[PDB]
């Protein structure tokens, strides 16, 4: 039973999010869910990131004060998110009396440490600067031990031998920001407070719960707890220098891993607002549910650094091809025959333990492919074993044994057989498809778990069931394409 804190980068208050931000919160959250699935205790936390110029220009465009918009923004993010099922233990805000407080104490240590410089620059002004050059070497011992992905160590390696400089943290008024102690009109950097900010959601989290131990337990510096951080790679230099080194500092741990992403593209390109694939999460959701975009992101994500390209045409294929035709089919083809020749009674043996212990053995592999983030690799793995089942009811043709009379016994036990298939293939997609995953559950009367895999249904009743995913269309998809060309 491991400790984990996961986060994922903190959303500027300044814009909506989109199908780009959602690859990041899918694939953090289908990780999350498979480790709670494994009996670890995990925190998943994020929070808007509302500060600096940022903020205070959209602020500006739209006449409004930046404490009236980053609450609507807050607001608008946690239901988009919430609309895709990010299952977040917490999602808090960069502006708040925790963030200001662990800001406040991170830097009062940094510069009782010596780690805070200060210098004049031009208009002049007096700025702080962070020693970042001081952690070189820890930074590189930390960046070489076998944590990191390659590319990215590889990335690192290169912004070592530019050399690393002193950071200017500081900013002058008007800037919507935590004012720096002992310095009137001078205020944090935003980029500064906003990883803090992982510390400050938090620290919330656990004031919330009324826990007392936690907060230090994860983050003190010999902490046994695991940290990480799923970002883009355009944030990697913050989170792979700045941050580790501030924390250093500061007495605190530094992150176990950084997990690094690629970008969206859209059809091959960057989105485009002109062709309507600049996709809001919100407008997505008005068109296709969430587990539609979440499968098809997890099909082709990896450990990698890669960009992941969303071809709508590839999409309503992959769909119906994968989730209807082979998931989803292996119950609807079976559950008709149960549910009306046996009132919904499973038989009370396998009718082929063999391929029953090829799927449960499969749980190794596909596990530590959810575990390593090689989300394509257990995607292939789960629709092999899919392919398997339905080439099983296949030969065994239930729908011939079905006009055979005195063949009742057979039928039950093939068709029972494929349904024990379809809830071992169900459970590897837990992290994938949580709303499926709620309507396989009620059919089958039964919560799915990692290890109940092991022991199948038997005499066991299973309840009638509506469809329990439809087929999508490309006219959905021109819908959506045509909708949001019209909001640009
Ligand atoms: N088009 C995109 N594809 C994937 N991630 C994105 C995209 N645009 C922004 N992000 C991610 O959103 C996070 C900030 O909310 C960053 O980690 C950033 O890399
Ligand atoms: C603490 S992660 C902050 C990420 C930043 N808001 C970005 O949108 O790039």
Known sequence: AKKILVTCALPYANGSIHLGHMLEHIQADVWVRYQRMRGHEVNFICADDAHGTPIMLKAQQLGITPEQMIGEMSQEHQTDFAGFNISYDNYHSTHSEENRQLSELIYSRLKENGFIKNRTISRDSEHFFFDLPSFSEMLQAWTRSGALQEQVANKMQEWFESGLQQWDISRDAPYFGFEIPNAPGKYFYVWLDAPIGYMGSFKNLCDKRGDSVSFDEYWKKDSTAELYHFIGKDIVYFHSLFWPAMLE????????????????????????????????????????????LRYYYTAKLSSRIDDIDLNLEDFVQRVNADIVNKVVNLASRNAGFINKRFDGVLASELADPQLYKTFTDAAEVIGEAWESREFGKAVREIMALADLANRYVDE??????????????????????????????????????????????????????????????????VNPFKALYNRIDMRQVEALVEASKEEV
């Open 396 to 461: 065994q043709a239930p729908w011939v044994v079905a006009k055979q009379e005195g063949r009742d016994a057979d039928l039950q036990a093939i068709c029972s057989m494929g349904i024990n298939l379809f809830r071992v293939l169900m459970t590897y997609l837990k992290p994938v498809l949580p709303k499926l995953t709620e309507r396989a559950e009620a059919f089958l009367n039964t919560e799915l778990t990692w290890d109940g895999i092991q022991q199948p249904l038997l005499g066991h009743k």
């Open 249 to 292: 500092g500061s007495n605190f741990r530094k992150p176990s891993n950084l997990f690094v992403h690629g970008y969206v593209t859209v059809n091959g390109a960057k989105m485009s607002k002109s062709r309507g694939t600049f996709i809001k999460a919100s407008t997505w959701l008005n068109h296709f549910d969430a587990d539609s």
